[PDB]
DNA sequence: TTTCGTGCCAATTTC
DNA sequence: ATTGGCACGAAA
């Protein structure tokens, strides 16, 4: 669970950029097929992004990278 | 919501489906402020 | 309390557009802060000024 | 009446300009005279105004001891003290048109008491006396440090103690002159005048009187270097507080009261007038205990100074004399300088947080606010 | 104003209209009510009045009359800078809000 | 004549 | 109630 955003704030720097980043990868978890990257413990994907965060696992420049590689992927396989 | 009447419904939906996500559009409100002013002579528009 | 709130919207409605938009200005102006003292008692320390 | 000194250190004294009488002590004939206690590490302790013609047991820098009386005066007299020592002759003082012979009747010690233009006769309102200075040889005396020849006027309601051919000296007064909570920081806010202002000097330079009586009294500025006599209009009832003859500076006190924050802002500027304001506010919250940054303080007198006045039009397309956005001043003069252009020239305006809310460029805001007619 | 001596804004009353009529017939005209203001907003020129009220600024010297011409040049070029006309202020329609 | 004093009128007052 | 701005009249 989660009582206290701080570990994620200085991973990130700021709450405001942490809230998009945070709802960025939430929402890939929650209509996208996405899988978590740390193991849920009956957790909603909020809070499992938060910890994703918190473990270095997820920033702005990561998700940049993986959307550029799965566009990548798709228009090299849609032939 | 509020007097945004499509997002409300909308709203519902996505919730129901189970997506936490808005598309907030333009509260009916300022359409009546926008009428009423009209009503007095007075030429107000939105632009671009 | 009616006061209160009266004041209190006057000022929202003044400086409700004010956010901070940058990171340095470059400036090099400023205020020289003093101790607050008032006839033979120092009302404020500098400490809490600056 | 007194100052009581309350620990021990080093006097300092500012804005001083005082003289040594008979007796050997030293006499404050200065107006803005600030008396502060500066300790062995040079922090400033305690502070204290000390009035003009005013009574020193101490000299400037000179060690004190806790509890101790550093200097006293009269409150109920306002002495003519002057600076050289020699014989009084009067000139263009005549009784009967510009004074009076009133004489106690117990005491016995009196002398002709001055009258002012509501009370003597229509002949004395072109007589402007004075009270010379002169040696053993009926010379005038000059004060050191200048040359003008050393005479003093006499204002009304004037009482003097020493007749003619009396000895004075240095430091003797010749005359005596007889004298919060919620809506104060909304009116701090608001940027209201008080209801006695009190009045400043709009320039610098020597001061004189000018046509008496011409429904209210007047004054004269005349700078030092050549420029144009300043008029003000003092209205009667009000307790002057400068002599005729006098130098002064601008943004200085000469009636007595509150001072509007429009007149800081016109003639000291807008650091004076932001910490003017925070420090009256925080005088307010502190005597209930409430702690407040001054941040939020000075973001509020920011908003405040949002207005500026064009006092010439210059190369820029702003017409003189009116009111504009200070950015957008700033945004014009810094493009036209960029191409080797002048600016325009420009003066800081005073709002309060009512009326600067409504000067605001976008109409949706000001509309949303109050008097949405007149804006819309 | 016409050949007469009658300026172009003075105001009558019903007893010196008639004897303005009995006297100079119809070399003037005169009228009450929102068209005879529609008339008058109608028929002046901003850019001339503005000229005009210019150089009335710029020959004398006073404090309030310098105010005066101020505000009232400041209306005029704000009424030139828009799209706006004077005689708009006249309402000849009336707008209805929906049901 | 120009400047200043004085009366009239509009706009404000919590949630 | 209070405050500010505008018209009106009276002062030098």
Same mark, same amino acid.
């Given at each position: 669970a989660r009582v206290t955003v701080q570990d994620a704030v200085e991973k990130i720097g700021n709450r405001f950029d942490l809230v998009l980043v945070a709802a960025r990868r939430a929402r890939q978890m929650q209509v996208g097929g996405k899988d978590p990257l740390v193991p849920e413990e009956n957790d909603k994907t909020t809070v499992i992004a938060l910890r994703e965060i918190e473990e270095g696992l997820i920033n702005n420049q990561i998700l940049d990278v993986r959307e550029r590689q799965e566009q990548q992927e798709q228009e090299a396989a849609e032939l | 919501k509020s007097d945004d009447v499509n997002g409300r419904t909308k709203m519902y939906k996505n919730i129901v489906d189970g997506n936490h996500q808005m598309e907030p559009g333009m509260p009916e409100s300022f359409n009546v402020l926008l009428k009423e002013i009209r009503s007095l002579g007075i030429n107000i528009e939105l632009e671009d | 309390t009616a006061n209160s709130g009266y004041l209190t919207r006057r000022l929202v409605d003044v400086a409700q557009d004010l956010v901070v938009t940058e990171d340095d200005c470059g400036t090099h102006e400023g205020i020289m802060m003093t101790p607050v003292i008032e006839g033979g008692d120092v009302k404020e320390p500098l400490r809490d000024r600056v | 009446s007194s100052i009581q000194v309350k620990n021990k250190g080093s006097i300092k004294l500012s804005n001083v300009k005082s003289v040594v009488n008979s007796s050997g002590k030293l006499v404050i004939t200065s107006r803005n005279t600030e008396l502060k206690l500066i300790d062995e590490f040079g922090r400033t302790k305690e502070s204290y105004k000390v009035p003009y013609g005013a009574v020193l047991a101490k000299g400037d820098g000179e060690q004190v001891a806790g509890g101790e009386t550093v200097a006293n005066w009269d409150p109920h007299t306002m002495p003519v003290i002057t600076e050289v020592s020699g014989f009084v002759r009067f000139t263009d003082m005549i009784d009967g048109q510009t004074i009076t012979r009133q004489t106690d009747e117990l005491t016995g010690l009196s002398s002709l008491v001055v009258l002012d233009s509501a009370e003597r006769?229509? $002949? $004395?309102?072109?007589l402007r006396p004075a009270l010379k200075i002169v040696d053993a040889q009926g010379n005038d005396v000059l004060i050191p440090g200048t040359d003008m020849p050393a005479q003093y006027f006499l204002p009304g309601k004037a009482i003097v103690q020493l007749e003619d051919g009396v000895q004075i000296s240095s430091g003797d007064t010749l005359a005596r002159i007889p004298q919060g909570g919620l809506p104060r920081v909304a009116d701090l806010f608001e940027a209201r005048r008080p209801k006695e202002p009190a009045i400043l000097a709009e320039i610098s330079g020597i001061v004189s009187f000018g046509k008496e009586t011409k429904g209210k009294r007047r004054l004269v500025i005349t700078p030092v270097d050549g420029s144009d006599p300043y008029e003000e209009m003092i209205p009667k009832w009000r307790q002057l507080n400068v002599f005729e003859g006098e130098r002064v500076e601008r943004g200085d006190v000469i009636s007595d009261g509150p001072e509007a924050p429009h007149d800081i802002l016109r003639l000291r500027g807008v650091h004076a007038v932001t910490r003017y304001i925070v420090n009256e506010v925080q005088d307010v919250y502190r005597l209930q205990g409430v702690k407040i940054n001054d941040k939020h303080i000075e973001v509020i007198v920011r908003q405040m100074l949002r207005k500026a006045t064009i006092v010439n039009a210059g190369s820029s397309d702003f017409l003189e004399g009116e009111q504009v956005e200070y950015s957008r001043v700033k945004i014009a003069n810094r493009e036209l300088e960029a191409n080797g252009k002048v600016g325009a020239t420009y003066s800081r305006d005073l709002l309060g947080i009512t009326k600067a809310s409504l000067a605001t460029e976008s109409f949706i805001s000001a509309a949303s606010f109050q008097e949405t007619t007149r804006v819309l | 104003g016409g050949m007469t001596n009658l300026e172009r804004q003075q105001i009558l009353t019903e007893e010196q209209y008639l004897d303005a009529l009995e006297e100079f017939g119809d070399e003037f005209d005169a009228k009450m009510g929102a068209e005879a203001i529609q008339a008058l907003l109608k028929s002046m020129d901003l850019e001339q009045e503005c000229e005009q009220l210019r150089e009335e600024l710029n020959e004398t010297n006073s404090e309030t009359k310098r105010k005066k011409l101020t505000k009232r040049i400041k209306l005029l070029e704000a009424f030139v800078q828009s799209g706006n006309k004077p005689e708009w202020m006249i309402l000849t329609v009336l707008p209805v809000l929906p049901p």
């Open positions: - | - | - | 006769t229509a $002949g $004395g309102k072109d | -």
